[PDB]
Amino acid sequence: VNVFRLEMEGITVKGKGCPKPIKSWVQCGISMKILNSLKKHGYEKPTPIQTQAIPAIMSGRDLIGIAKTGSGKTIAFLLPMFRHIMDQRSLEEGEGPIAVIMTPTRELALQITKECKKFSKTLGLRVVCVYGGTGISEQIAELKRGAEIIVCTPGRMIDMLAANSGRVTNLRRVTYVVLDEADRMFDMGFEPQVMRIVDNVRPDRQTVMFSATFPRAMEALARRILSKPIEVQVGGRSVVCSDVEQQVIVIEEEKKFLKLLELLGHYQESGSVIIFVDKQEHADGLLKDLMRASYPCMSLHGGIDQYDRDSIINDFKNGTCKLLVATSVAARGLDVKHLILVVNYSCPNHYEDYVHRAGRTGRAGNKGYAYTFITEDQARYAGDIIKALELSGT
Amino acid sequence: VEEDRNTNVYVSGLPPDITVDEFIQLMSKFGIIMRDPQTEEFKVKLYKDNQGNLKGDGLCCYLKRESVELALKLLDEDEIRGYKLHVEVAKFQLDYKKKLSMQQKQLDWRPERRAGRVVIIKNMFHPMDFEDDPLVLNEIREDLRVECSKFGQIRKLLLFDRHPDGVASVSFRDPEEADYCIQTLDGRWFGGRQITAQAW
RNA sequence: GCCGGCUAAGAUCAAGUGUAGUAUCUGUUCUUAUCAGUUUAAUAUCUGAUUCCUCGAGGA
């Protein structure tokens, strides 16, 4: 029932027919060797980019993932590919790899080969040992004995394809095409080499691309080579609106009412504002304290009747009530043009309620103000609030 | 409640043409003036009328109490060029530790003397690459500025586009940040060439 | 410092801040192991070599 909490963690997902992210590597549909390598490497919890890319690579569809530096994109490209190679074994033909990994640098290709050897440890699968600027005879002797994956340079791959040392057959040769640092491969320098690498490939083969940054033109150039791609970045799915300004202040539980009274008294946050509370009795007490302080305020919660809540909503929409106290039920789905300010005095336990409270004000391209009071008790939601502020650009 | 430990002094009567700077000089003659910790602007107030008119009264708070008792027996009944001032303990009727410790350290007795901040980078670029690329020099300068901003506050950054060795100067506010940038830039690769860093 | 101990007794490696100078803070790690060489007043440091048990996993 907590499938929405994995998507709210902050992982923009785009595409049709996207599988659910896995919580751990033990229930991700991986083989025994990949799980043994993950247990030997010391991975207790998987990365969110890895949890978004591993079912997309296990399902057999094209995926394009973007994340920060050092997030584990090489392991996220090597582990489901090795799991699909171990689960669906094929005949190791001559001079034909089952996977093609493209790296723009020789040191990056050597690091990808070392990561693939560490992910395929305690097994007979040796992928590749080749780099640019070295002896081609040793690389040909290493590739002639058997090659599972092909992680090298595009120039070395073009030289191997021109000298008939390595190529992709038409019927069944490779099933996955990995592209590490796809922003550099889609540039003007590596365009015809990547075009000749993608042209001489099998028709029934998946294409994977991973990079730290991704421009619009590079993504538009890379989307033409894939067939129905699935995008995975951060953050978009269940994220806060960028048009509404978010503000977080560190105050106590008793000082929150004084901060709200100072924002209503000194600043212009009293009129046309929606105040989110934790419970209905606390919202009624805050509404009574606002009405006792010579300020017109209305309240809408589950403890009140439906007609009184409708009258309070009509008074907030018409302009009769300056402030409107509401619970978490009115945070999502409410589309009021008068709600310009969103005062979150009580922080919710879930980030989706805070995202719905921030998105309730300043919609349809308009600006908005959102001020939330962060306390010491909401320490678990502070990381989610920081991730939402980093995704929204606040 | 606080009877003494009052570091505020009240200057009864002043020339109606008193500026703030002459007043803070008068007050700094008798010790260090406490500064508002969040900001600059020493804690000195010139009391004013309903208008620009100068009532002629002044308030000044001091770091210590001995400076108050100094101003009491040296400024009271003493004439500035025209007028007769009066000095009295101020009457009141109706972040923190960081700057407190700094103002305290303004009274130190630490050893002076000693020696009594520019990093030079070489082998970073070439003039031949800027002849057919007018946007490569600005991108290299922006990359050098983004590299120098992570080590400290860069006050001045220049790049010699006509030097055959690729000379660049990065002047920061502190020599420790320049030494850290020279330690992090020595032996590093930039644009396929090994660039070197030295002090100035 | 308290009544031999509760790891505030030391070294170190990366980054930040800042001074004319000294410095200040965070992550750390700390070999729990042996032998040979360097070295140290002695440590230190550096330079190299070195299957069993438990419930596919962990420890040695």
From Swiss-Prot, chain B:
Q: What is known of its domains?
A: The RRM domains mediate interaction with U snRNPs. The RRM domains specifically bind poly-ADP-ribosylated RPA1.
What job does the chain carry out? Component of the 17S U2 SnRNP complex of the spliceosome, a large ribonucleoprotein complex that removes introns from transcribed pre-mRNAs. The 17S U2 SnRNP complex (1) directly participates in early spliceosome assembly and (2) mediates recognition of the intron branch site during pre-mRNA splicing by promoting the selection of the pre-mRNA branch-site adenosine, the nucleophile for the first step of splicing. Within the 17S U2 SnRNP complex, HTATSF1 is required to stabilize the branchpoint-interacting stem loop.
Q: Where does the RRM domain start and stop, copy by copy? A: 7-92, 117-200
**Subunit-level organization:** Component of the 17S U2 SnRNP complex, a ribonucleoprotein complex that contains small nuclear RNA (snRNA) U2 and a number of specific proteins. Within the 17S U2 SnRNP complex, interacts (via UHM region) directly with SF3B1. Component of a complex which is at least composed of HTATSF1/Tat-SF1, the P-TEFb complex components CDK9 and CCNT1, RNA polymerase II, SUPT5H, and NCL/nucleolin. Interacts with GTF2F2/RAP30 and POLR2A. Interacts with TCERG1/CA150. Interacts with (poly-ADP-ribosylated) RPA1; promoting HTATSF1 recruitment to DNA damage sites.
What protein family does this chain belong to?
A: Belongs to the HTATSF1 family.
Task: Please give one Gene Ontology molecular function term for this protein.
Answer: chromatin-protein adaptor activity
In Swiss-Prot or TrEMBL terms, this protein is called 17S U2 SnRNP complex component HTATSF1
Q: Which GO terms describe its cellular component?
A: nucleoplasm; nucleus; site of double-strand break; spliceosomal complex; U2 snRNP; U2-type spliceosomal complex
Chain intervals for the UniProt region annotation (U2AF homology motif (UHM)): 117-200
Q: Which GO terms describe its biological process?
A: double-strand break repair via homologous recombination; mRNA splicing, via spliceosome; protein localization to site of double-strand break; U2-type prespliceosome assembly
Mutating residue 10 to D leads to what result? Loss of interaction with U snRNPs
Q: In which tissues is it expressed?
A: Widely expressed.
List where this protein forms a coiled coil: none
Residues recorded as bearing N6-acetyllysine in the entry: 150
Domain of life of the source: Eukaryota
Organism the protein comes from = Homo sapiens
Q: Where in the cell is it found?
A: Nucleus; Chromosome
Q: Which UniProt keywords apply?
A: Acetylation, Activator, Chromosome, DNA damage, DNA repair, Isopeptide bond, mRNA processing, mRNA splicing, Nucleus, Phosphoprotein, Repeat, RNA-binding, Spliceosome, Transcription, Transcription regulation, Ubl conjugation
